[PDB]
Design a protein around this ligand. Sequence first.
Ligand code: 3PE
Ligand code: PLC
Lengths: 243, 164, 86, 108, 53, 125, 246, 88, 83, 47
Amino acid sequence: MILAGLILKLALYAILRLLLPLLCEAQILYTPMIYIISLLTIILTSLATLRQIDLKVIIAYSSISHMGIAILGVCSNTSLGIYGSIVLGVAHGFVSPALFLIVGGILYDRYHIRIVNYYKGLTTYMPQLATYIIILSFANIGTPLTGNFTGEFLSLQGGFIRNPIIGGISCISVLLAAIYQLKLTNKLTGGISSIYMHRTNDVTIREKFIMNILIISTLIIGICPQIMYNLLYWTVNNYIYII
Amino acid sequence: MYNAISLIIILPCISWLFPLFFGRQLGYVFVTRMTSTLIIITTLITYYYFYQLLGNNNPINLELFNYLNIDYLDINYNFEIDALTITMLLAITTISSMVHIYSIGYMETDPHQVRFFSLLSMFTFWMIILVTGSNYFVLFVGWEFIGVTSYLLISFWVTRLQAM
Amino acid sequence: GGGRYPFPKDVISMTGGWWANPSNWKLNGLFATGIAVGLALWVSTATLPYTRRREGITSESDISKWNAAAGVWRERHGKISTGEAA
Amino acid sequence: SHPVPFSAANKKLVTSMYRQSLKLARNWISNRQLFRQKAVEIRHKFDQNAQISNPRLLARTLDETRAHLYEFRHPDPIVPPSFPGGTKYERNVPPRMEKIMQHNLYEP
Amino acid sequence: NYKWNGPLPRPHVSAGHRIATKFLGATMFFWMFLRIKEEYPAMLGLHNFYPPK
Amino acid sequence: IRASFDKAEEPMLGDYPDIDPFPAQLKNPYKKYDDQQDRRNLEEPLSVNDDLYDMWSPDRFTHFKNQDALKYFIGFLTIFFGASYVATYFVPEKAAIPREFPYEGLWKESGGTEKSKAFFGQRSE
Amino acid sequence: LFHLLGHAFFKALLFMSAGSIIHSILNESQDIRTYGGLLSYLPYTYICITIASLSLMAMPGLTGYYTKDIIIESTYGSYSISNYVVYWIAYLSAVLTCVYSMKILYLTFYSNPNNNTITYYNAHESNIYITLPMFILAIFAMFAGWILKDIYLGVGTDFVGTHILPNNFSYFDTEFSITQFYKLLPLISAILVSILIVVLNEFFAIVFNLNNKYINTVYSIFNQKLVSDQILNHFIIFKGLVTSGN
Amino acid sequence: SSAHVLTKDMIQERIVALLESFDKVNDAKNITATANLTSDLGLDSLDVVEVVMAIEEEFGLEIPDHDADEIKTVQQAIDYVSAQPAAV
Amino acid sequence: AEFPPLLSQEDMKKHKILLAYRDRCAALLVPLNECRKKNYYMPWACGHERHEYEMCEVADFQRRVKAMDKLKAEKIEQAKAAA
Amino acid sequence: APQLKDPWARREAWRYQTNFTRANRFKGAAPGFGIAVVAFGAYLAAE
Ligand SMILES: CCCCCCCCCCCCCCCCCC(=O)OC[C@H](COP(=O)(O)OCCN)OC(=O)CCCCCCCCCCCCCCCCC
Ligand SMILES: CCCCCCCCCCCC(=O)OC[C@H](COP(=O)(O)OCC[N+](C)(C)C)OC(=O)CCCCCCCCCCC
């Protein structure tokens, strides 16, 4: 939770605070190489996710993808790119910890294994866990009214502005995120209860507290992202090198 | 204290959300009738609105709060019932009301009626948000969430593998 | 009822569960209809001011003024319309 | 190979071929009269060659039936709704009645 | 009284279904004839808008 | 049958059993398996690429082999579009001209400026 | 836009009648090949489905006639020369409409039975909750077209004021250039092929039951959605999963 | 709506009627729960197949080979049709 | 004249006609739209006005037909001047 | 010469007897025709 939520956001803060206000001309010269690298990060990691077996590893690969979108935006020399790449980092640090809680402190606590092949049919005996899985899955992929869409859209606005081709070929993340997340959500919530797994309790109130916080926060910034502008209206323009 | 457009937009939202919060307390019987009746009230609002628009044809708007005013980009949650919108509403609202009444007799014997009726009204509310919205963004919201709701409805029999 | 089969009772969902029809639902149905009606009224009365007809709000003389000023800015900045460059 | 003309294994085989041919007729044909006509024609085509004794010609005939059945396959066979290839198979499975095993000493 | 091979009896359909079925068929066929009478030249293409030659 | 991808992984298996894959969708449904939905018995060995060869995998089709299927699909499409091109050479002439409009093609009401008439001017008159 | 409004009314009705059919039968099958002759058993479901099919076949006075024939006409009435072919493709789509509609009607109501007996002992019309929506939707598919064609398809309506480019406006030419042949052949054929395939299915059913190996393969193509369902999975999805594992 | 249920007697009545309509049977009044197909009723090794196909269409089933070839008795077929909840 | 008087640009702008209908025949479209707006756009309502505007535009159609006849005649003339 | 009989015909006969013949399979079709013909004649008389 600490890693995905914060330590990967440090890399973004490092760009904005060390690499852009200085080294401006190197950014505007070497940006296309960044777009190459971020684009390969997006698609290859998403496709690598389609053929994994461990639950926690899949959420991890998604974190690589959303950071790579956020790099397209912050490294785009535009205001909307900065305000999107930041909002991606925030909403990602709300959504991903919830998923790592679901797959690492719920299921692994109950049954002590992370292989998808065992898991199937939670909806029958663990319905509330099903509801949370689908909500967080549709927030991860970037369903609107969630910060993980508003940040996707804005970063892809700015990435399209800088290089339209790369910023449009990177729109397939809107699809590939849905593929590697829904192929899994369908398995878990779907089917008849696994013979390998006995029954255990539904989610307890402690975990329900956590997931409901991490969902209220992202729904808020998904509904009115403008609240975060009062801190960032300078930062969207300090780091823009345009004559 | 009357608003065709406000009532068109909130009543379906009531019928989608209240069952999800209160279904164990209310039972599938009352839920079927409440969602049916509220979506009936909505259809009457649209037929009468259709009459008025034929009389005058100045569309009503509904300019709500700001989603994003950053830099050369103002996106509000605006809503409007224009001519094209009121026709799409006639199809949506009429068909959804009929289906909410037909899916009482078809879905008796089914244990999970509450979630079924909540989803039908969910789809109705989100298409209403689609046809109404006065900007492409409010359209994209309805675009995505009806596809979400379609996943849940087609998956309504979660045990049936092919449905998933 | 018809076509039923057993089901666990400890399973709890915000929704019914299996064939949910508690022996108090008339009262809870009353509470829910009351809240829903109050919400619908609060919303309609709140959104009334934020309505407007598409037209009738802005006089045409204001539109003519604004289009005049548009021409003024365009010629001060020495700009030409679309297609004239031919 | 040794496909014996008067043994149980050939009986199982030819009974399966007869079942399959009849179902193929029932799936391909709409009307009922023509279904009964084709059924009777197939029973005739079978009784005509129930009498063979040489294993070689027998096995050649079985191969010809295999090729024929492969040549009149149906892509959307009629199957009952509550049975595997049907529309109502695992619709409402009665959940297995299980008891709550516990995992933690303090949490429910 | 189930003849598992016999000629089956006539179905015992209710009145609301026999009454309403006849009502819808009446209104359908009446709406067809009334429209066709008032609109045959248009659907038959008998008005020749083309100029005389 | 072992496909390309499934026998390019031969050098890597080490000790793992080199199973011959068979998708479960073609396994007999009428047999009693432990996991009746996925058509798998408990200690059944798994292929290295079982994620492709289970029931949650994309559906196979057993009627047409896929090459003939591609022939049929593209042949239908090409027939349709080629007929739709060829039949543009067997088209009758229009019985009347396009409509024409009074004020010089309505260049003013289409947003003209007396020099962009080519861009905005509708039909002559 | 007008065909959307109609298409809702005369299609949701069909799906509701399909449900009342499917539940009157014991095992909830969805195969016409095992329905037969429920006409005497299910009259109300029958009259409703045939209304929608005729509102789908553009019978006179029903919504589908107004909503559909006019599009078949504007294909001829367009200023573009190459759109003439689309008239025929739409016309073949129309005669196919009357085909598959009457097929369902014969196979489900007029034909000889093809289930067991008990299905016919227990067939019964469904409750009030099912009928009344089919009643109202039937009223809409009967009357909405003539009630609303003055708003949408009218001459100078101004209700849906989309700023048409004048160069592309052809509704006047559509309604006037069109001749008798090009105004009747759709309606004639919709009646005639409909009645015909009924006659063939009821008297000369061999014609659909040749058991030729070159016809049956073409039936296999048009079943399975022009094998596209097998193109998609194998060449796109499966060659995405393998590339993904690569 | 579909207020209908099956019973062992009803299945027996329908099976014997199905067999009474079969021309290649020896003769009536041999048909009983203890009736064999190959010995008593005097049927070929394909008439048993046709009879099983007939029971399928009658009670709306799908009987595979490994369950069909073991039907050598009418009471066996009754116990089988009683061992399918969807026996119509 | 089978056509009525052409409207001026300003009365067109005043009634807010659509540009496809802003042609020679626009004078009779105005009362028709007014009667429709009055009668709630029902079909039994303004049949006379509809008949008027339809006949007027049919007259325009026949004029355009004769112009196409002229164009075909001229091209055949040019053809049998080329040989 | 090509003519054979089905051993099941007594079973397959109820698909062709009463309320399943070429008459009864086509009676309830056009269920409300006659009343509407009479009404259309009455209304043309009412002109
Ligand atoms: C090779 C590298 C590709 C890199 C770029 C990405 C390309 C597009 C994405 C393809 C990548 C492979 C996707 C694999 C995901 C598979 C996930 C899965 O296992 O679910 C299977 C599912 C189908 O489920 P199925 O088994 O068929 O069930 C039906 C039975 N009821 O599968 C599905 O439902 C399919 C979901 C994907 C739908 C994509 C459809 C594309 C069709 C394009 C046709 C051309 C249209 C023209 C486009 C214009 C472009 C200018
Ligand atoms: C937009 C911000 C969020 C809005 C609030 C939505 C959450 C409300 C609580 C729902 C409880 C519930 O739906 O129940 C949970 C259902 C239970 O099914 P059941 O009907 O009770 O029967 C019980 C029979 N079992 C036990 C066999 C299932 O689990 C599921 O089958 C998985 C479906 C999840 C539906 C999700 C609802 C739609 C929300 C999607 C918006 C992204």
